[PDB]
Ligand binder design. Structure first.
Ligand SMILES: *[C@@H]1O[C@H](CO)[C@@H](O[C@@H]2O[C@H](CO)[C@@H](O[C@@H]3O[C@H](CO)[C@@H](O)[C@H](O)[C@H]3NC(C)=O)[C@H](O)[C@H]2NC(C)=O)[C@H](O)[C@H]1NC(C)=O
Ligand SMILES: *[C@@H]1O[C@H](CO)[C@@H](O[C@@H]2O[C@H](CO)[C@@H](O)[C@H](O)[C@H]2NC(C)=O)[C@H](O)[C@H]1NC(C)=O
Ligand SMILES: *[C@@H]1O[C@H](CO)[C@@H](O)[C@H](O)[C@H]1NC(C)=O
Ligand SMILES: *C(=O)NCCCCCC
Lengths: 253, 114
């Protein structure tokens, strides 16, 4: 996955993400695709969650999966989740849950609770920062005012770091793939550096839905695992997601 | 290796863009058991394809049937009841798609399972 929260010259927030998933079922040697990735594209749906014929939050999810991986509350905040890798991952977290310690929330469910029930960017931020979880994760969260955008690197029981926007110091975007910002990306899978060069070439002035979709279409930020691309605009209420393909030639991950 | 940053790719067109994705409206005023009924009636065949393709990868290590008996018969009680809307939301999805509850749960906790 790749999640970006950018801020144009006039303080407008654009939140874009790519959803990479599907290495686990293997490879389709006949047309050069991942088995799950191709099977998730016809399952991808957009969801207008309503209460009293009024939109609570919108989302992009896979049909039959009740948690939320991409979504926003119109005019409030936007939230995408990126997978984080760890030593044992969810497995301790799952073990503790079976043996009886249920004081922690499942990863898809918490972002589902935050999108459905949180009221502000600060409320969402506080809950994603300090809620116990069963597995590590990246929470990429943008707000409705200027400077309200951050990546929350999460351990199971602790917030390792929160990387926020600072336009005054020249930081107008936050990128996050699947590796800790202070650490280095795995040699064979660096999508964070091309994402930045494309954002840097685009310039803060020109960042928009069109240029944000541009960077998420550049290989390897676009790759065989990319199921969909979502561009969010919390203030304008716009929420578009598009199924993707990466025709040969294209990197696999 | 990286590629030259792409230009003029929006609105989406070309071999980069499989197609738009449809909107469904989920009414939270309905009880959780009935929230996904409309969506799952239209999407049940596609999710059944995944569970098939999930069985084939499992089969290459240990036989799948014996694996899936345990997931369906013993996992839902192993994990207990999930909080809030989710136990009912997943129970609804399991009934409308004719897919066992353990597999609907396995789908929904796939992140923790990696
Ligand atoms: C590479 O080859 C794969 C296998 O040939 C393709 O996977 C197929 O994609 C189809 C469309 O994306 C899926 O369609 C669904 O098929 C099931 C099975 O019969 C039907 O029930 C569904 O009704 C049907 N569509 C919907 C909307 O329900 C296939 O299931 C799927 N096959 C497999 C084995 O996964 C890849 O799409 C293909 N990729 C490329 C880039 O060519
Ligand atoms: C969001 O919060 C509301 C209220 O705090 C929750 O709604 C209640 O949920 C319980 C369990 O599902 C039900 O027994 C109540 O009837 C619900 N009340 C209302 C007024 O809806 C809701 O479950 C929360 N959503 C999430 C995803 O956690
Ligand atoms: C932005 O979010 C805040 C809550 O953090 C809310 O009070 C406000 O009405 C929202 N809209 C604007 C324009 O500030
Ligand atoms: C994206 O980087 N990781 C994506 C989501 C994992 C999806 C779990 C079903």
């Amino acid at each position: 996955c790749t999640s970006i929260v950018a801020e144009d010259k006039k303080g407008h927030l654009i939140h874009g993400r790519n959803m990479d998933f599907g290495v686990f079922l293997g490879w389709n040697i006949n047309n050069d695709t991942w088995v799950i990735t191709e099977q998730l594209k016809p399952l991808t749906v957009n969801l207008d969650f309503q209460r009293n014929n009024k939109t609570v939050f919108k989302a992009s999810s896979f049909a039959g999966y009740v948690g939320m991986l991409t979504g926003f509350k119109p005019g409030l905040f936007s939230l995408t989740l990126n997978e984080r890798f760890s030593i044992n991952g969810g497995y301790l977290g799952i073990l503790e849950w079976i043996l009886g310690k249920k004081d922690a929330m499942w990863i898809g469910f918490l972002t589902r609770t935050v999108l459905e029930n949180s009221t502000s960017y600060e409320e969402a931020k506080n809950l994603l920062t300090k809620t116990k979880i069963l597995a590590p994760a990246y929470f990429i969260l943008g707000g409705n005012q200027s400077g309200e955008g951050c990546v929350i690197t999460r351990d199971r029981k602790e917030s390792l770091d929160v990387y926020e926007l600072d336009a005054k110091q020249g930081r107008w975007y936050v990128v996050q793939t699947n590796y800790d910002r202070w650490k280095h990306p795995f040699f064979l899978d660096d999508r964070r550096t091309p994402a930045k060069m494309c954002l840097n070439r685009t310039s803060q002035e020109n960042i928009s839905f069109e240029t944000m979709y541009d960077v998420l279409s550049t290989k390897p930020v676009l790759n065989k695992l990319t199921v969909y691309t979502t561009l969010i605009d919390v203030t304008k209420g716009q929420f578009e997601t598009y199924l993707r393909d990466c025709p040969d030639p294209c990197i696999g991950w | 290796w990286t590629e030259d940053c792409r230009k003029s790719t929006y609105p989406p067109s070309g071999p980069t863009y499989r197609g738009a994705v449809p909107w469904y409206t989920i009414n939270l005023d309905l009880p959780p058991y009935k929230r996904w009924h409309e969506l799952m009636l239209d999407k049940a065949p596609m999710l059944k394809v995944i569970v098939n393709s999930l069985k084939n990868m499992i089969n290459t290590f240990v036989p799948s049937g014996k694996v899936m008996q345990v997931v369906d018969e013993k996992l839902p009680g192993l994990l207990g009841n999930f909080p809030g809307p989710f136990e009912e939301e997943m129970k609804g999805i399991a009934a409308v798609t004719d897919i066992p509850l353990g597999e609907i749960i396995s789908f929904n906790i796939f992140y923790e399972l990696f």
